[PDB]
Every structure is written in structure tokens, then in C-alpha cells.
Design a protein around this ligand. Structure first.
Ligand SMILES: CNC(=O)CN1C[C@@H](C(=O)Nc2cncc3cc(S(C)(=O)=O)ccc23)c2cc(Cl)ccc2C1=O
Ligand SMILES: CNC(=O)CN1C[C@@H](C(=O)Nc2cncc3cc(S(C)(=O)=O)ccc23)c2cc(Cl)ccc2C1=O
Ligand SMILES: [Cl-]
Lengths: 305, 298
């Protein structure tokens, strides 16, 4: 029993965090095998940030301009290349603490753990979701650039996010581990804004199934809905459209609790109309959308209360 | 910017988790130096009588794919200490500390000696923790990190009928009036950790959330009467002194912020949220707020 926002154990990722310094800029790098991956803006000055030509800035750098520090040991850079918005520094030592890993690009609504670091040193771990507007509501300060997001399903670490910037509204933007940004963002200090955000509907539904598993049913009703009528109502509350894929994905939770997806959609509809009326669901007075159908199955039991 | 419930990096603790099996019972153990610490109910009650019948080979300790050889055993309160033949090479710098209600810590939840997740939580005033635990989680541990030293403060033992959790410090002393047995036990009525709600209101002001601030101030005596009416823990002069740095950083006196909390209790949020919450959050200490709004590393 119980339902917490839970992050993956960060140990396998802590053993990969290094500090990358290029001139006056210092940020974090991810050391896997004999390569250190970090944001390419480490080669920029704050001036360059408005309209930087990364190819022109990089061609003027030599291997010895990059200082890579792994704990108290200095790593020797023996090569460098750029892949999209990520800089790849070939080092002379392979990381002995390199875990089994994959680079994965995630879709909006997917969750992951973030290991926030400063000066190549991990400070904290938290769980978050890729928002529909491609931003993450993280907790990052200056020096956090290069911190990574990951999932550890089985003994393999799937790296999905590398932190690059904070937007004017306080939300965060970054890339996959191949340097491709999530969202229409650029690694420039230019006027950029996050688009209007929406609630991840499939995740709120998953969280309502987690509440039923933990013995709470006060929000259920005797009604059902069509998929289209659900979306006509949900769109008015800034909720993402629920697709047939989402319905199929909620199948196992529907079978475990005996509550059809469209009947759970009717409870959601009524919750949006009525609010909670002094009640909470899983200790929350808001409808939670940062737990996927997969997270709920992982954290909750197989026997409903 | 941003404010998340943040746990300490779990790496130093992951390297200490082992699986302990005794007969049919399987739970988690903490391997530090040449000793494995685990709940004494793994032998299940008259514990000294159950223990005297057991021999070293009855205990199966597994560290990853390696079997550890038990060469001795003793009991300390509600914790079983299994002397093993191998000292843990991944043993970090550590201390066993007992925490007070209101203090927070990270929990590394494990099943079969394998860490599955990490979360942050607080020791409630009623000595329970609102954790996320399933069967097999017994022996999971709670900790904080101070520089490079891990301070172990909690070991999981049981789930109460309301779904909340009970456990001990690493010396086997329970937090709360609980016993390690399946008997009629219930968590007492809980209260809100006032100093923590105040700390979280200062974190909101730091992140640019000031709609709840007012021109009023109050006295500690007047505020404590309001706190008693809403099931909030009494605010002490120590709590006020502890909030000093946050008061200085934001320019808002502690009794000035108390008057805001007083108005939130009597009138609600009115459709508004603070740090993305429609409830007053009490699981961030004044220290957690300063650490997260500064960037302290380990
Ligand atoms: C909020 N940012 C700024 O004012 C300046 N700025 C610097 C940099 C950037 O965003 N770094 C940061 C990353 N993560 C959290 C950050 C929190 C802060 S703070 C003190 O807590 O506001 C400051 C900076 C952060 C950057 C990188 C790129 Cl690729 C593109 C643009 C920029 C940029 O605009
Ligand atoms: C709710 N528990 C029970 O019905 C039986 N029970 C077993 C055991 C105990 O509490 N273990 C558990 C610990 N943490 C989470 C647990 C979640 C669950 S569940 C399937 O997800 O409901 C079950 C058991 C859990 C225990 C240990 C001691 Cl020292 C004293 C008493 C007991 C005890 O009463
Ligand atoms: Cl995905």
C-alpha cells in the first residue's frame, strides 16, 4: 500500500557523471565507455549565446582546450566531434563503471528520473514527465546543464534526456542523447517560449486506476461515455485528446480493477465538472498526470483492495 | 527554477543492499563492513527463544549473485545482526542516527535485495511514514547524506491497517508506540508539520509565488492557538530561529509568514495553487528548502 512519486535508483548514473570545462564555462558530462557526452554550448561564451555558429566555434578548439574531470582524476581528451546539439569528447580512459545502456528518444507523456548535478557532482534525484509542450517541469539551477534523465527497466539504463536550458517561465528544455531537441527549441539565448501546456489524460486515467487499486472509489459513477464525447469535454479543460492507443494501453488496468476505460473516462468527466469537494485522491487535491500506465503497474500490487 | 520532492542520490546505499532468507521468509538486509543488519522478524513471538534454535547456516545471505557465509549472529532490540565472512568492499562512510518527527529522509525501496526505487519522505508527528511499500520491502532503509557520509536513520518493518508504515532506527528501536508482530496496532491521529509548511511557503516566495503574502504580522501565542485548531504541530521559538536564514533571504519575518499561513487556514486557496499544489505541503524541512535553492552536491 501507498503511492509515491518514485525515481529509479541513481547509482548506475552517478558512476557516469563528470565535470566538463571549456574556458570559463563549466557544466556536466556523461562518461560512457571512452566518450563524454555534454551540451555543445559548453564552447560558447554568454555573448555567443545570441547567434552562435557552433561549427565555427568548434573548429577553433583543440583537444587540450577541454578539461574533463572524473572525481579527483583528470581525463585526457584525445578527440572531439559534434552530433546535433551534443558535443562528444573522446577520452583516453574507458569508464570502468559504465553500465549496460541504450539511448532512447521518448514521447510526450513518458516519465523518467532526473539526476541533477553541479560540477560533475550529483546533488539529487527526482521523477518527472516530458510535457505535451516538450518541456519538463524540473528543478534546476545554473551549472545543472548536462544533467540527465533516464529509466532503468531491468539492469539496463535507458538515457532519454540531457538538460540544456531554462525557459522564461521557469520550465526546462533539453535533448535526447543524440543531440536532438525535444520541442521547437534551439540552444540560443533568443526569445523562445514554451507553448500552452495540456494535461496528460492517459496518465490521469492511470492514476485513477492506481487509486482504485489502493481502495478508493468515491469518484466512480454509474455512467459511461463514447470516446468522442469524452474528448469534446476534456478538450474544454485543456486535457490532451485520448486516442484509441491510450485506451488499448489502459487495458490491463481495466481488467485488473473491473472498470472499463470509458467508464473510468466518465468518472474523469465528472471530476472535471465537480472538483474534489474537500476530498483527495492518493493524497492529492489535484488530478495527477506524471504517472504513466506502466509506472502504475510497476509500483502497485497485482491484487486490488 | 522549479521545486521537486528530491531524494539523495542512492548509489552509496545500493552497494549495501543484500537479500536475507531464513526458512520461508525473505526480506532485505544492509551489509556494512562484515555485518548484515535486517529486521529480526525474518526468523518468524519470543524472539530470543526463536533465535537460540537457529544456527548460522539457517540464514542465507545473498549479495547480487554471490552467497555470503554467515559466521555469527546477535540481536539488538528489533534488528538482527548477521556477522558475515566478507567485509563489504562498497561500504561507504556511515553513521547510525535517530531522527525526530518532522525530519525528512530518502528511502531506497528493495525487494529480494534488489533496489527498485527511491523516494523522499518525512517522519510524521505520529511516528509513521507515508511510504510506498509492498510485501518483500521489509529491511528497506531510509537515509540522508552529509557531504560523503551516509546517515542511516530508518529500517522498514511493517505496514499498518491504514496503509502507512512503521519501522526502527538502525539500532532496532521503533519510531512510535509500535511492536514487531501481527497484533491490533493503529497509527495515532496525525498532525501537520508547521515549520515545514512555513519553509515551503518561503520556497514559493523564492520561486516568485507571493499571492498569499499580506501586510500583517502576528505573535507566536496567537498563531499557536490557530495551529491547535487546524491540527498543526505547535510552532516553537526553535522553529522560528531555524527559519531565520529564509526570513533574511526573502525579507519576510517568520511571524509575518505565520499571518499568511493563518489566513490560508481560515480561508483556503480560492482556486489558486502554491508550487503546483492545492494543499499546504509539509514534507520539506527548512534545510531541504535551502539545499534545493542553492545546489549542494555529494
Ligand atoms: C534562465 N536562463 C537564463 O536566464 C540564461 N540562459 C543561460 C543558459 C540556461 O538557461 N541555463 C540554465 C539551465 N537550467 C537551469 C537554469 C536556472 C537558472 S536560475 C539562476 O535558477 O534562473 C539559470 C540558468 C539555468 C542557456 C542555455 C541555452 Cl542552451 C540557451 C539559453 C540559455 C539562457 O537563456
Ligand atoms: C499489512 N500487513 C499484513 O497484513 C501482515 N503483516 C506482515 C508484515 C508487514 O506488515 N509487511 C509489510 C511491510 N510493508 C508493506 C506491506 C504491504 C503489504 S500489501 C500486500 O501491499 O498490502 C503487505 C505487507 C507489508 C508484518 C511485519 C511486522 Cl514486524 C508486524 C506485522 C506485520 C503484519 O501484520
Ligand atoms: Cl516513450
Amino acid at each position: 500500500s501507498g503511492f509515491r512519486k518514485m525515481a529509479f535508483p541513481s547509482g548506475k548514473v552517478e558512476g557516469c557523471m563528470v565535470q566538463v570545462t571549456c574556458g570559463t564555462t563549466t557544466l556536466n558530462g556523461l562518461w560512457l565507455d571512452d566518450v563524454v557526452y555534454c551540451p555543445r554550448h559548453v564552447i560558447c561564451t554568454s555573448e555567443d549565446m545570441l547567434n552562435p555558429n557552433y561549427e565555427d566555434l568548434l573548429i577553433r578548439k583543440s583537444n587540450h582546450n577541454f578539461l574533463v574531470q572524473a572525481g579527483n582524476v583528470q581525463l585526457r581528451v584525445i578527440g572531439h566531434s559534434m552530433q546535433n546539439c551534443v558535443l562528444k569528447l573522446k577520452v583516453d580512459t574507458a569508464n570502468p563503471k559504465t553500465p549496460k545502456y541504450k539511448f532512447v528518444r521518448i514521447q510526450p507523456g513518458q516519465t523518467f528520473s532526473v539526476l541533477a548535478c553541479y560540477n560533475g557532482s550529483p546533488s539529487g534525484v527526482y521523477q518527472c514527465a516530458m510535457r505535451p509542450n516538450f518541456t519538463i517541469k524540473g528543478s534546476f539551477l545554473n551549472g545543472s546543464c548536462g544533467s540527465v534523465g533516464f529509466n532503468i527497466d531491468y539492469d539496463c539504463v535507458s538515457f532519454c534526456y540531457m538538460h540544456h536550458m531554462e525557459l522564461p517561465t521557469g520550465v526546462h528544455a533539453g535533448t535526447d542523447l543524440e543531440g536532438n531537441f525535444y520541442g521547437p527549441f534551439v540552444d540560443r539565448q533568443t526569445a523562445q517560449a514554451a507553448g500552452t501546456d495540456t494535461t496528460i489524460t492517459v496518465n490521469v486515467l492511470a492514476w485513477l486506476y492506481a487509486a482504485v487499486i489502493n481502495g478508493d472509489r468515491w469518484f466512480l459513477n454509474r455512467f459511461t461515455t463514447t470516446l468522442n464525447d469524452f474528448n469534446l469535454v476534456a478538450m474544454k479543460y485543456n486535457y490532451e485528446p485520448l486516442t484509441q492507443d491510450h485506451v488499448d494501453i489502459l487495458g490491463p488496468l481495466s481488467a485488473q480493477t473491473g472498470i472499463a476505460v470509458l467508464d473510468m473516462c466518465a468518472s474523469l468527466k465528472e471530476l472535471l465538472q465537480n472538483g474534489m469537494n474537500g476530498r483527495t485522491i492518493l493524497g492529492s487535491a489535484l488530478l495527477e498526470d506524471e504517472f504513466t500506465p506502466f509506472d502504475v503497474v510497476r509500483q502497485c500490487s497485482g491484487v486490488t483492495f
